[PDB]
Amino acid sequence: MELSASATELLQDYMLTLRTKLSSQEIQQFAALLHEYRNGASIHEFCINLRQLYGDSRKFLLLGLRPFIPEKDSQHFENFLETIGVKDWDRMISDISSDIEALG
Q1: Which domains does the chain possess?
Q2: How far apart are CA 43 and CA 92, in angstroms?
Q3: Where does the signal sequence lie?
Q4: Which of 5, 92, 98, 101 is the most exposed place for a label (fewest CB within 10 A)?
């Protein structure tokens, strides 16, 4: 066996980090992008839109987004992280969470 952390707590952690770096509006925008991604938007468009929303100063946050990306898109996501040089409420939290689970 191995040590692991639940998707729930990880999500909570990532959300707290976002509240640390993003405004309420920006967080809502994040949720909307996540929703579009769940509804069939490509991983590429999702990445681009996230990099646009976060901006150059907050794009590092994308690293912590990694565990929530489906296995099928994980390689593309990693390549995006490498490309951008970063590698190498509760009612809304429920929608975000459901989107996360659905992606998995």
Answers
A1: 2-104 (1.20.1160.20)
A2: 22
A3: none
A4: 5
Q: Are 7 and 104 in contact (CB under 8 A)?
A: yes
Are the CB atoms for 33 and 49 separated by under 8 Å?
yes
C-alpha distance from residue 57 to each of 8, 64, 68, 82, 96 (Å): 27, 15, 22, 16, 23
Q: How many alpha carbons lie under 13 Å from residue 24 in its C-beta half-sphere? A: 3
Instruction: Name the token pair of 71.
Output: 């296995």
Asked if 93 contacts 15 with a C-beta cutoff of 8 angstroms, the reply is yes
Closest CA to 65 of 4, 17, 2: 17
Distance CA(97)–CA(27), nearest Å, equals: 14
Name the one residue in this structure whose structure tokens are 């952690």: 13
Q: Is 40 left (phi over 0), alpha (psi -120 to 50) or beta?
A: left
- Answer yes or no: are the C-beta atoms of 15 and 99 closer than 8 Å: no
Experimental determination approach used: X-ray
Residue 95 token pair: 């929608």
